[PDB]
Design an enzyme around this catalytic site. Structure first.
Site, short mmCIF file in Angstrom:
data_model
loop_
_atom_site.label_atom_id
_atom_site.label_comp_id
_atom_site.label_asym_id
_atom_site.label_seq_id
_atom_site.Cartn_x
_atom_site.Cartn_y
_atom_site.Cartn_z
N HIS B 63 0.84 -1.20 0.00
CA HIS B 63 0.00 0.00 0.00
C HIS B 63 0.88 1.26 0.00
O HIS B 63 0.94 1.99 -1.00
CB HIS B 63 -0.93 -0.05 1.21
N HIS B 82 -1.75 0.94 8.27
CA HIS B 82 -3.19 0.94 7.99
C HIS B 82 -3.85 -0.43 8.11
O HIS B 82 -4.91 -0.63 7.54
CB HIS B 82 -3.51 1.68 6.69
S1 FES Z 1 1.29 1.03 4.34
FE1 FES Z 1 0.58 -1.05 4.94
S2 FES Z 1 -1.66 -0.81 5.34
FE2 FES Z 1 -1.07 1.18 4.37
#
Ligand code: FES
Ligand SMILES: Nc1nc2c(c(=O)[nH]1)N[C@H]1C(S)=C(S)[C@@H](COP(=O)(O)OP(=O)(O)OC[C@H]3O[C@@H](n4cnc5c(=O)[nH]c(N)nc54)[C@H](O)[C@@H]3O)O[C@H]1N2
Ligand SMILES: Nc1nc2c(c(=O)[nH]1)N[C@H]1C(S)=C(S)[C@@H](COP(=O)(O)OP(=O)(O)OC[C@H]3O[C@@H](n4cnc5c(=O)[nH]c(N)nc54)[C@H](O)[C@@H]3O)O[C@H]1N2
Ligand code: F3S
Ligand SMILES: [Mo+4]
Ligand SMILES: [O]
Lengths: 842, 133
Positions: B63, B82
């Site tokens: 992500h 997140h």
């Molecule tokens: S950087 Fe891993 S959940 Fe957003």
């Protein structure tokens, strides 16, 4: 696990064309940009040969702007030519600060691409049922047929024989241009009464209670969630459903990162890291994330019995009022002080079906709502101590006697929950009593679904309560149905019965059409009308894909969605942005607003031909050639502050846009409104808010208590993070469908053992309303007796087992559903590759 | 000139260096792309060795690139930023999370002397626009 095997992506070049894009999907309205450039060109790793000005031959660090995932890349048509496109989140947008959810970050890959073969299900041509099956045709043919049947039925039976289902929302499949064009057609040119909305079976508001109290439901700003002492989150699973609002605004509060800003903006009072009350029968990933961020001592999960929020809120209001933890100056200056008389059928029933609750002064509402802690503990199943703690976290003054700032946010756990009108009012009572409206760190707001983008002519003719359209259809009424951007087969209440009747009625018209000659158009129209007269239904679908309800329709008209057109909408803090067109509609697809205009033009032509020139003339005012024309006729002329807003001005404001309503334009900037009600003047004739005398009266909607008493499990229902809506796009997205080929039903593992189920087993959920299927997903956090099934999903529709029960204003009570569960099949081979592990971060 | 990425065949470790259910830090396809080798004790997708139970993954969250932690009790990778969760017993499938990719998994090969080589990756690694820079 699905893997794309895309080892490298084209680099955005330094001269790529940049377009402002709001996310197509949820309420949060995260900012993006789409960068496009010619198919035979590309960027390079040297700083001067890419849009980022950085050296892409090196590994980027966490949170770099100079990266994008394969789901953010595609090739699309733009002005007739293939172009590379990247659609990536805007680091500078204050909503999301560069975050992209699992949904928004796949906008590019869920775009139509002939070169890369994405979303080949997209509609390209008008389709008509003729010669035994659906056949492609011209717009002129399809529109003529729709208008001839529609015009004949309305002329012979009245406008009440036209049934409409349409979006009323913003973002893709809605927005100001599209709501205006459909609204002008059905409410200006016509006076359609038998109209329903995408998510509810009548032309109502989701939140009549707050609106009648004078409190518009989008009254705060996202910064408020950063500034509150306490967040009260009712019937929301915000990590999954309002993701980047939660992550970019709530989380900084709970972590204490916003403390500096709190002390700066509000120096004359104490501030600690945010605490949060979560009112939800289910322990969700949202609860888990809050505990992990703030610590468990700063999270109060009130895991109420399904449908008992009103009892909780009334006990909170009672306790807070009795302690005097109220903003007496706000109450005296900005709320109704008048004595009022309870209506004769109170407390069980309001003055009429139009008015389920009794609007009053503070004092009268307290006395009417009055509920003891012990009585609410009995109803809700909570411990007395939990309810008292919540009252303290909402109402208790901080050190020095300063008023505690509380943001109250609610969504569909309340709205589709028990006794919508009273429950909504009971929550607003708390916000009103504590002065938490129109000030920093406050608000009593919907957390929202879709973006918002409503502007339409008056709906006064629909009535209140409005017609229960699904019941008309099920009961054999109506002749013609226009369906715009919704799919009742997957998302309505009482969906199993709905599908059974809808199929039979549309089949009558199918059978007539197949047997009549199409090339003699008059004979075709007469055969259709004859089948309608016998109890059939002629149905037209306007959509971007072959829908489930579309399988029953006679004409399909292809729409273009956001990004293939310019579109305006606002987010959950009223932040209005322009999404700038970066690609062409697939095939002959057309924006909804222009379909509505072309249909209006066709109706004017057909009615003139039939000799009804006066009715024909009501369909003038649709000379639009582009969606901007609908923007200018609708929003610009009708919205408050509309005269300050144009595409050119919006474009210059970028993804930050401005907050509605606009109050002026100065120095190239539309000026907006950060918070509503900052002067304490509310949206009523006298400017005062009303409290609501809203006593608990059990499960209000017909049949609900008997459904609960006669079935074994709660069938709670709602969203999953990875799935967008009814999976209309997602069904052709391997990343999504590889994760959940069937909808999950979360089940307690002991419940599973008792029912002889194992992970992945295909089960039937059934009750008095209908039956459906889902895949058992062992969920240790689920309470015994309580399941949660993903809603809206094509490979097993949860709505099939929701009853027809609504409140008095025809709000669908989806959340209160109970049923039985039995196995259909041992886990199919097509779920062997699934993880069934906990969704909770560890 | 080449249509596809040219992956190097890089030795990462020897099977003898791996303990059941304890990640070993590695980097592939170069030293700036962190990942792990993990022996899971049960045959799984992409798994190599006598038991088909040795896997390699990128441990940078797809992500926003936060380093993932391993939960030995759940046998999951977990993202503190997140709240994402990835399942190395199921091809790196995102159990719940914000990424639009399941966890990039290494194509592994065990030589006759027990040396483990990586020779490809099945998704785009966080923070590079080409897996081989
Ligand atoms: S950087 Fe891993 S959940 Fe957003
Ligand atoms: N049991 C249960 N049922 C529920 C709910 C629940 O909690 N429980 N939630 C309710 C809620 S909140 C909602 S929002 C509804 C959703 O119910 P629907 O609105 O029926 O569901 P969507 O999947 O949003 O359907 C959108 C449709 O519009 C089409 N579309 C997308 N973009 C465009 C466009 O630009 N133009 C046109 N013409 N069509 C387009 C899509 O292809 C799709 O067919 O479901 C409701 N139903
Ligand atoms: N990932 C993703 N996000 C989306 C959407 C989506 O399709 N996918 N859709 C968007 C739309 S259109 C909307 S309307 C919103 C919906 O956003 P939410 O309303 O946040 O989502 P739901 O999953 O419908 O329901 C929220 C919670 O209500 C709880 N609930 C059930 N019954 C009760 C009850 O009696 N009382 C209380 N207090 N809570 C109850 C459920 O346990 C659930 O956790 O999400 C939007 N965001
Ligand atoms: S990326 Fe899109 S789905 Fe919602 S959280 Fe942001 S608007
Ligand atoms: Mo909704
Ligand atoms: O919604």
């Amino acid at each position: 696990a699905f893997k794309r095997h895309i080892d490298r992506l084209p680099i955005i070049p330094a001269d790529a064309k940049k377009h402002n894009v709001t996310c197509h999907f949820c309420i949060v309205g995260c900012g993006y940009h789409a960068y496009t450039w010619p198919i035979n060109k590309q960027g390079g790793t040297d700083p001067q040969n890419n849009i980022f000005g950085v050296d892409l031959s090196e590994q980027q660090q966490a949170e770099s702007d100079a990266w994008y995932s394969p789901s953010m890349y595609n090739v699309v048509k733009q002005d007739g030519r293939d172009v590379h496109v990247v659609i990536k989140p805007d680091h500078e947008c204050v909503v999301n600060s560069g975050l992209g959810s699992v949904r928004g970050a796949r906008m590019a890959e869920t775009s139509f691409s002939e070169a890369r073969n994405t979303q080949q299900q997209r509609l390209t041509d008008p389709l008509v049922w003729r010669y035994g099956q659906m056949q492609p045709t011209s717009w002129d043919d399809a529109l003529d047929l729709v208008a001839r049947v529609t015009a004949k039925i309305v002329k012979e039976k009245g406008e009440d024989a036209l049934i409409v289902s349409a979006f009323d929302h913003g973002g893709a499949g809605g927005g100001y241009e599209n709501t205006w064009g459909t609204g002008k057609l059905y409410f200006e040119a016509m006076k359609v009464k038998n109209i329903r909305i995408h998510n509810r079976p009548a032309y109502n508001s989701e939140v009549h209670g707050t609106r009648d109290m004078g409190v518009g439901e989008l009254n705060n700003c996202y910064e408020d969630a950063e500034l509150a002492d306490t967040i009260v989150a009712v019937g929301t699973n915000a990590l999954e459903t309002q993701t980047n609002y939660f992550l970019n605004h709530w989380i900084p509060n709970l972590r204490g990162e916003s403390l500096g800003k709190k002390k700066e903006l509000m120096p004359e009072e104490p501030h600690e890291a945010g605490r949060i009350i979560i009112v939800d029968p289910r322990r969700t990933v949202t609860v888990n994330a809050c505990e992990q961020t703030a610590g468990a001592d700063n999270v109060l999960h009130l895991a109420i019995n399904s449908g008992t929020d009103l009892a909780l809120f009334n006990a909170l209001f009672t306790y807070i009022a009795d302690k005097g933890w109220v903003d007496r100056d706000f109450i005296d200056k900005s709320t109704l002080r008048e004595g009022t008389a309870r209506p004769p059928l109170y407390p069980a029933r309001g003055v009429s079906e139009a008015n389920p609750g009794h609007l009053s002064s503070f004092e009268d509402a307290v006395e009417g709502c009055r509920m003891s802690i012990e009585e609410a503990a009995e109803i809700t199943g909570l411990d007395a101590a939990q309810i008292i703690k919540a009252a303290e976290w909402i109402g208790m003054p901080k050190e020095g006697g300063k008023r505690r700032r509380v943001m109250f946010g609610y969504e569909k756990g309340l709205i589709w929950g028990n006794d919508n009108y009273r429950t909504n009012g009971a929550l607003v009572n708390l916000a009103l009593a504590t002065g938490n409206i129109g000030r920093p760190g406050g608000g009593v707001v919907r957390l929202g679904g879709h973006q918002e983008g409503y502007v339409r002519p008056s709906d006064a003719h629909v009535g209140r309560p409005a017609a229960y359209v699904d019941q008309l259809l099920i009961g054999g009424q109506g002749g013609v149905h226009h369906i715009w951007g919704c799919d009742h087969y997957k998302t309505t209440l009482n969906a199993h019965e709905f599908k059974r009747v809808y199929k039979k009625r549309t089949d009558m018209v199918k059978d007539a059409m197949s047997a009549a000659p199409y090339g003699d158009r008059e004979a075709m129209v007469n055969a259709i009308v004859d089948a309608i007269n016998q109890g059939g239904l002629f149905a037209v679908n306007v959509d971007i894909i072959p829908t489930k309800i579309g399988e029953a329709c006679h004409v399909i008209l292809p729409a273009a969605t956001s990004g293939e057109m310019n579109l305006t909408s606002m987010n959950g803090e009223r932040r209005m942005r322009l999404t700038e067109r970066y690609m062409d509609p697939p095939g002959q697809s057309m924006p909804d607003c222009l379909i509505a205009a072309r249909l209006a033009n066709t109706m004017e032509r057909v009615l003139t031909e039939m000799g009804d020139v006066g009715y024909a003339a009501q369909f003038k005012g649709f000379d639009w050639q582009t969606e901007e024309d609908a923007f200018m006729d609708g929003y610009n002329k009708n919205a408050h502050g509309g005269e300050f807003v144009t595409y050119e001005r919006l474009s210059a404001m970028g993804t930050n846009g401005f907050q509605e309503p606009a109050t002026g334009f100065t120095d190239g900037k539309i000026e907006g409104t950060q918070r509503l009600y900052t002067d304490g003047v509310f949206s009523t004739d006298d400017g005062k808010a009303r409290f609501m005398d809203a006593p608990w009266r059990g499960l209000q909607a017909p049949g609900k208590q008997q459904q609960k008493d006669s079935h074994k499990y709660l069938i709670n229902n709602g969203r999953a993070n990875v799935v967008w809506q009814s999976a209309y796009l997602d069904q052709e997205n391997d990343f999504v469908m590889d994760r959940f080929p069937y909808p999950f039903i979360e089940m307690n593992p002991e419940d599973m053992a008792e029912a002889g189920l194992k992970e992945g087993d295909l089960v039937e959920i059934y009750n008095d309303a209908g039956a459906t299927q889902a895949m058992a997903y062992p969920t240790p956090t689920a309470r015994r007796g309580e399941t949660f099934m993903l809603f809206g999903f094509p490979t097993g529709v949860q709505g099939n087992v929701t009853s027809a029960g609504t409140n008095e204003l025809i709000i669908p009570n989806y959340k209160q559903t109970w049923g039985n569960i039995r196995k259909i099949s041992d886990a199919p081979r097509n779920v062997a590759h699934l993880s069934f592990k906990s969704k909770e971060y560890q | 000139a080449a249509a596809g990425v040219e992956y190097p065949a890089n030795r990462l470790a020897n099977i003898s260096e791996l303990t059941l259910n304890e990640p070993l830090d590695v980097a592939y396809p170069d030293e700036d792309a962190a990942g792990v080798l993990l022996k899971l004790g049960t045959r799984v997708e992409g798994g190599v060795g006598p038991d088909g139970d040795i896997v390699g993954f990128s441990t940078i969250c797809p992500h926003k690139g936060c380093p993932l932690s391993y939960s030995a009790d759940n046998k999951t990778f977990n993202c503190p930023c997140h709240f994402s969760v990835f399942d190395p017993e199921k091809g790196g499938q995102q159990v719940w999370g914000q990424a639009t990719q399941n966890l990039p998994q290494y194509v592994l090969r065990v030589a006759d002397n027990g040396d483990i080589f990586a020779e490809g990756v099945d998704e785009l690694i966080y923070g590079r626009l080409s897996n081989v820079l």
